[PDB]
Design a protein around this nucleic acid. Structure first.
Ligand SMILES: Cc1cn([C@H]2C[C@H](O)[C@@H](COP(=O)(O)OP(=O)(O)OP(=O)(O)O)O2)c(=O)[nH]c1=O
Ligand SMILES: Cc1cn([C@H]2C[C@H](O)[C@@H](COP(=O)(O)OP(=O)(O)OP(=O)(O)O)O2)c(=O)[nH]c1=O
Ligand SMILES: [Ca+2]
Ligand SMILES: [Ca+2]
Ligand SMILES: [Ca+2]
Ligand SMILES: [Ca+2]
Lengths: 362, 362
DNA sequence: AAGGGTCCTAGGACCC
DNA sequence: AAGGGTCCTAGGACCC
């Protein structure tokens, strides 16, 4: 059970999509803004200090030449996201989406097939594509090294297909599990790829500077761990398993501690079509009357075009306004607009934000 | 979309299984007891006032000749339950389990096929099997009547197969939806079947004496409705839809009101294998120390034989003690006994009853 | 109540 | 934070 996983991570996704549709901006520092924040920017702005989720006031101070584009509508980003995922599904069907700009692909079966076709002659000619983490020396007699290098040839083939067929650049990380692949995909960060050989796994995890940098350890876990004196990856590695179970739970304990060692057995799960369709909208309390209806009529309006185009139909609705939410099934005659409004207004009456969600698709 | 549903309801299920294994009791009034209650009894005891979930002290007062058998282990009942369900799956694959002794079967496709094979000659010879609700007159030119009578021939074939192949008696109710089928299956209650023709649907629902008798309206709904002055089925029929939405919710409102009219569009859902495996055990606070471990070791012990025999493996565990519960995933090396005990004891420490549940089967 | 099962809600963590 | 997504917990209703 020696897996070959690849983590694909696109560069400044939103900026890439905007730069593509308008080539004019491709040359100047671009900032995609939602409300009062530059949520992402092309790398030109990165040099000028423009940073992720940065106030537009601040962002313009550091870069007064910034060109700002609105990214509050994710229709184009979402479409490109699934074009990327489908391209990777062409390589291997088992592709896991993480957000809009990241994908895991299990290449294990793919790598084995490519090797069963080779012979001793070319097995020595097996080369690497991209960087080798920590400049580690390859050993062509280590079968795991060869499988990982083939995994890097596939990753390079994916990255070339994305730019050729979709015009997108991105990073790739090849490793033996999802954790390590995702940690190594960013070592060389602009449109580059890296492969992690087993001997350097500890070097990689210890390269992290705080346990919060481990995928799987969020804010709550990080701040709990930070209460037991744990802070570095080695602090978690060498902590007492026994205390850790009591504070977080047998589940959280044994999993994140394994993560601290670079161990992660979680499988790459086929994402498939989405389980929910939603659309939000924040504002400075702008809604405090029945205007909220017209708002809900707007969130609703766009959603219907999406949940219909999908092909599958939703059987549950959620209204959201920490948030709160009330939900309820959807009638059958309804499943086949005016009824949906009032439905969501009684969900409202029972109860700055107005998010509508269609779930329970069949 | 004119469905032909059948509701199968076995008579005194537990008593039937006990009477079968021991024929000696078949002749005397039998009471299956769990702790201090006769949960069910054969019909001989029914004459003597022995009633469902009746104190053994009371039950023995009314019938001092009662023979009591322990039914705290449901292994044999559960096995027979699935033998019945599988027998009905042989007739039509879409079978829905409700508890251990009830099944819904959608006969729509089956009835249509049987009719497409007939000719005008035998269409007039189409007879009914069992009772016709309210002694309603059949009309052999009403296609829905003919479909429902064919549904009653199938139901009679099911009931004969259960007694012949499994030795069990039971009731059958043929109607156009699950609600009406289940309400009509009990009109003639000992080892008999009834069919509901559309003209008598209102007679059936109004035969009910309180809205709590409607499947779908439990205790909470009944006691809410009872606060708005609603009590009879007609009270709910003629109540304001508008108030009802506010008090219970758009979902609960429109569904139970439809039920009050005998309308129920819910589909017969294939149950398949179970989604969870559990085993409970009540006691008079008997457990207040580490003995609870030995208990958990016992609940666990038996469960493993069940969750293994299934073929699928569980990926989540629940410990229960209104109840409360803590749950957590299950390690992989574990998925393939000593580890499980302590796992459940840390679930314990975090927290009269000790129920263990295996869920998340794959 | 007994012993045993459904599915649904709200909210909770996490990810981008 | 923005706008948008995962899956998991605990408890809640319901059924026999
Ligand atoms: C980290 C993070 C990212 N994002 C999303 C929203 C932005 O559009 C987008 C910007 O991050 P990215 O563009 O993905 O980060 P990057 O520009 O360094 O490129 P890469 O992905 O290869 O690292 O990520 C969040 O919404 N919330 C978050 O907490
Ligand atoms: C109504 C009800 C039944 N049961 C289960 C447990 C008993 O073993 C069993 C006894 O009821 P049944 O035997 O099913 O009822 P019955 O003897 O009148 O025959 P029929 O099913 O055809 O009506 O039902 C409950 O556990 N809780 C309940 O609230
Ligand atoms: Ca990213
Ligand atoms: Ca980047
Ligand atoms: Ca019953
Ligand atoms: Ca009965």
């Amino acid at each position: 059970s020696s897996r070959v996983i690849v983590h694909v991570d696109l560069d400044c996704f939103y900026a890439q999509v905007e730069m593509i549709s308008n080539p004019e901006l491709k040359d100047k520092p671009l900032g995609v803004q939602q409300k009062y924040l530059v949520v992402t920017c092309n790398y030109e702005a990165a040099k000028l200090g423009v940073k992720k989720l940065m106030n537009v006031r601040d962002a313009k101070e550091k870069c007064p030449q910034l060109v700002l584009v609105n990214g509050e509508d994710l229709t184009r980003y979402r479409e490109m996201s699934y074009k990327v995922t489908e391209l990777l599904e062409e390589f291997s069907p088992v592709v896991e989406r993480l957000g809009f700009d990241e994908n895991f692909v299990d290449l294990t079966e793919m790598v084995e097939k490519r090797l069963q076709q080779l012979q001793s002659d070319e097995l020595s000619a097996v080369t690497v594509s991209g960087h080798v983490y920590n400049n580690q020396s390859i050993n062509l007699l280590d079968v795991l090294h060869i499988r990982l290098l083939v995994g890097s040839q596939i990753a390079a083939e994916m990255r070339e297909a994305m730019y050729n067929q979709l015009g997108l650049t991105g990073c790739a990380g090849v490793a033996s599990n999802k954790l390590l692949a995702k940690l190594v995909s960013g070592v060389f960060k602009p449109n580059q790829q890296t492969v992690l050989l087993p001997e350097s796994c500890q070097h990689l995890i210890h390269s992290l500077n705080h346990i919060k940098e481990i995928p799987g350890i969020g804010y709550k876990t990080a701040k709990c761990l930070e209460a037991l004196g744990i802070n570095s990856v080695r602090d978690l590695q060498t902590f007492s398993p026994k205390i850790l179970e009591k504070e977080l739970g047998i589940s959280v304990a044994q999993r994140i501690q394994k993560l601290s060692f670079g161990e992660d057995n979680s499988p790459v799960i086929l994402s498939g079509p989405p389980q929910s369709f939603s659309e939000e909208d924040s504002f400075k309390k702008c809604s405090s009357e029945v205007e909220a209806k017209n708002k809900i009529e707007e969130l609703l309006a766009s959603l219907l075009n999406r949940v219909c185009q999908d092909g599958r139909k939703p059987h549950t609705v959620r209204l959201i306004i920490g948030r709160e939410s009330r939900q309820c099934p959807i009638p059958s005659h309804v499943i086949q607009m005016t009824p949906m409004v009032d439905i969501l207004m009684k969900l409202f009456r029972n109860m700055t934000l107005l998010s509508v969600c269609f779930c329970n698709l069949k």
